Amino acid sequence: MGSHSMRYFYTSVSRPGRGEPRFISVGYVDDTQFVRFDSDAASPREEPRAPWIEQEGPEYWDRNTQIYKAQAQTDRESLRNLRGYYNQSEAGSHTLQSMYGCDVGPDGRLLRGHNQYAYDGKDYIALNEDLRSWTAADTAAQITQRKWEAARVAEQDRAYLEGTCVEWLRRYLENGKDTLERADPPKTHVTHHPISDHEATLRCWALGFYPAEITLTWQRDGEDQTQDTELVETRPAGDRTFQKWAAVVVPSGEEQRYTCHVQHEGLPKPLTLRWEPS
Template sequence: MRPPCHCVLLLLLLFHLSGTWADLDGSFTVRLLQTSTFQNNSFVDTEGLGLLEDIELGSLDKHTWTIRFHQPWVRPALPRSDWDTIQNMIKIYLQQFSYLVNEGAMQKEVPYPFVVQCTAGCQLYSNMTSRIFGYVGYNGQDFLSFSVSNGSWLLSQDTDLSRYVQAFLQNYTAFSELVEVLFNDTCVDDMELLLQYGKAALERREPPVATVFARTPGPAQLLLVCHVTGFYPRPISVAWLRDGREVPPGPGLNTSAVLPNADLTYQLRSVLAVAPRDGHSYACRVRHRSLGTRSLLVPWGSSEVVLITGIGAGVLAAVAVVAIAVLWVWRRRKRQQMEVSESRNSILSNEA
């Protein structure tokens, strides 16, 4: 079956738009997602989406096979004539894709309906190098993956159909040539132009908001929950501190995956299981690009949120000890003053 290779062709067409990004701070990944549902040999429903990290650059109008721009700065990045060329190439690609899939389905007696999914893209680094990847799915299951090291397709499931597609892709020399043009020319040549238009979106920073609360699933267990939300970009570090020292990974510590919010920010939860009244102090520490060198520190049992700058766990513990000592001395002195005052009042009362 020939069709999966043509997912890469669509990627090439849209990479004039999305695959030419250099990195402002680390690396960026560009992905093209394609889902084609074949109801029968005469009807196919195709959806396509181009992403830069989590930014939706554009999508495919499945009725007209034209590009819909999701960001105001995407269309001006290229001349109108270039967009016309890209859209014409997309229409040609989709016609060929549908034809070749149906042809392969007939040869291998694949029953309708079925779904072909493709994910392809590249990760671009600040030193102008790149890493490419490609995955093919069939009916919601991994089918093939692309190996960058030797330029070959690997079986994700060993079936007669997957071996048939793998053999075709290995012999499709035009694929290698197109990839070479893409990464040696397009990604590098258009990089500065696209950065100029998308820089503000790529540099967007939203600071996290963190809260700590507790749950008691049983009398012998206390679950401390650190909920962090509203942050952008996605990378974030969340850790628990016990008496100022970071809690190492273990069965009692469970941190969720980063999940999207409706406002294009992210959230996650970190849950720490502790024994009730164990005598330790706990705090949730959050590090994020929007905070710079500072960290967000939310102690358990306190509504106060603290921003700390470059303070290590040992220093935090020492500060806590000093604060407790100062508070103890202050209370002792106050108690002594109250005892002296009460003694004086008693003497004066006796004299009267």
């Protein structure tokens, strides 16, 4: 692709009897978090979470903090409205999540924008790819849709995604270029773990890679072993990089028929590995 993304992820959660709903936001460029805000912080403020954003001046942090405080209030009204749209009790805890942002290509041009919401973990409403129209999941979301149509909300959302979001993403990519534009390839190896006299596990490891997107596959005699491969979810190491493994159970003596194939944007060419007994 050469492409990049910026995303904001908001979570509001009600907690009847335990105060007003908590609002959390995090911002990402690609797989790198760069800001947070938490309404339960002793002094809620947007805070930097990557080195390259620390250079933004006080006006940045002050503006953004005001935006999140207003957003938290709007989300509290949204949660009240949603409880009513679903005929729900005031006794229960409910969750509103929102995700929005933009994708750009290597030249900085908009590829697409996103602006969508979920209620209790279920898709609720989304801005369509055209940035003009909405898709509502159910008759409750159709209320929101009618209100947002009447107010021409999508126009403001389009303007943000095509203007602000792309312009600030481009700035972040320039300021963070040494890390955000650097792919770190996986360090790979294969381990062997006897299970019984007649079978063993071959585990293909990928360590230390960024971004998180990777493909690890095993082949037997050149045929992909999809149903027989155990994959773990890609996981963060805590130093910006990610880890993953894929395993297969193989008959004793047949190890050399199996190859692990690794694809990652940090690799000029995909890797083929095998178990190397010493």
